[PDB]
A = this chain, B = another copy of it.
Amino acid sequence: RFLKVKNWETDVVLTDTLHLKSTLETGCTEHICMGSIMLPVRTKDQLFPLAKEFLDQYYSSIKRFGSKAHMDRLEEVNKEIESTSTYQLKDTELIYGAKHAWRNASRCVGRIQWSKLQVFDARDCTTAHGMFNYICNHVKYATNKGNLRSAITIFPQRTDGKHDFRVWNSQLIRYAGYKQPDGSTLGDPANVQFTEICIQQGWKAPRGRFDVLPLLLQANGNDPELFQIPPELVLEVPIRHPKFDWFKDLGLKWYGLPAVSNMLLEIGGLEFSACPFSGWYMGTEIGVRDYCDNSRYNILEEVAKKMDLDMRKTSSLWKDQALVEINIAVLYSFQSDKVTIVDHHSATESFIKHMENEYRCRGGCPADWVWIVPPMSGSITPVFHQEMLNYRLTPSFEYQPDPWNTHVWKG
């Protein structure tokens, strides 16, 4: 069955067939849509099928479907599964898998870059210190002195679920958050719980507004260990405004490398629980969400005062005016320091081209409108006017429970 999506600003209509290759569920039903809900070990029995589907997808991609190599590989994997209850991916398959998990990530607006992902194979890693070393190398490679390069580091896959590798941080680089006894929060409120865990594990917190958190790494199911990322490897950008000189006085800054590190990467049934990946920021992530969310740094009021805006009534749109300025500042500061970053207009325009290309060459592009449309100026970006279909393809990136909720402490 064919499904069509229309762009209401350009009348361009596209046909989606790729959704037929989707077997996973969305969370919605014929009677209800859960499109705005944030969060809507395997056995041989179930592993064989998943491996085959994947290998079939892989061999078709290299134009070797049905070849001897394809058949030999399928036989080899099946023997290995029956013989060990699992199987190891070849390097080529891992790279293909990682790239496609990105290509299939419906919430990511930066997918036009999917094929250029640098994949670091850390499957030979066995200890927390080893993990730290791999992570430091990823950060330095990806940061590339400001000329950011997309990358992902893949640690050993899950086996019995009791020997998991996990990066307890939600992002490799992030600022600590501290709940004060007067009820206020110093730093980033989003990371208060994790910061408390770090302190308990022994981290000596400098209790500032922008303290880079330490890495809390778990290897082979052991208790996590603390490590400090070499400061020389953490690139930060002081935020200033091109017209307002008092902006710099707000004492704001952010890190240049966004590296999600708490997701699970699934490839051919295999589960990679520690797979930190990084790209580069879209301005609004920082300027709109990290700085202006009421539950994050929440700087709107202060910026509004400095601008001497009429804050007596919302209809003055003081919040909106300030939001724009803060976002102009974030983009300007990053550009001035030559640290890669993309504004939402540029990012969304590129996503539309990528999407159309994907329909034509792949038969579709699963996309989550709720996440794709920028958190500011929605309708003045092309994606707002673009109908999208959301469905789950594999390989894929999945959410997983925070480790502190499930880890069996060994002492």
* Count of chain A residues with a beta carbon within 8 Å of a chain B beta carbon: 68
The answer to whether B321 touches A324, judged by C-beta atoms less than 8 angstroms apart, is yes
**Interface check A352, CB cutoff 8 A:** no
The answer to whether A9 touches B376, judged by C-beta atoms less than 8 angstroms apart, is no
The answer to whether A380 touches B292, judged by C-beta atoms less than 8 angstroms apart, is yes
**Interface check A180, CB cutoff 8 A:** no
The answer to whether A35 touches B345, judged by C-beta atoms less than 8 angstroms apart, is no
Contact flag A29-B29 (CB < 8 Å), given A343-B317, A377-B319? yes
Residues of B within 8 A of A332 (CB): 315
3 closest A-B pairs by CB: A35-B35, A36-B369, A375-B379
The answer to whether B31 touches A19, judged by C-beta atoms less than 8 angstroms apart, is yes
With both beta carbons as reference points, the residue of chain B lying nearest to A325 in the complex is identified as B321
Interface residues of A in 173-215 (CB under 8 A from B): none
**Distance of A9 Cα from B289 Cα, bound (Å):** 11
**Distance of A300 Cα from B38 Cα, bound (Å):** 33
Residues of B within 8 A of A370 (CB): 35-36, 369-370
With both beta carbons as reference points, the residue of chain B lying nearest to A293 in the complex is identified as B379
**Interface check A323, CB cutoff 8 A:** yes
**Interface check A373, CB cutoff 8 A:** yes
The answer to whether B324 touches A36, judged by C-beta atoms less than 8 angstroms apart, is no
**Distance of A294 Cα from B9 Cα, bound (Å):** 7
One of A124-132, A161-169, A386-394 at the interface: A386-394
**Interface check A314, CB cutoff 8 A:** yes
Which single member of B28, B293, B374 contacts A29 (CB below 8 Å)?
B28
Contact flag A391-B35 (CB < 8 Å), given A331-B315, A377-B319? no
- Indicate with 1 or 0, residue by residue over A323-338, a CB within 8 angstroms of chain B CB atoms: 1100110011001000
**Distance of A3 Cα from B389 Cα, bound (Å):** 23
**Interface check A43, CB cutoff 8 A:** no
The answer to whether A317 touches B331, judged by C-beta atoms less than 8 angstroms apart, is yes
Interface residues of A in 241-296 (CB under 8 A from B): 283, 288-289, 292-295
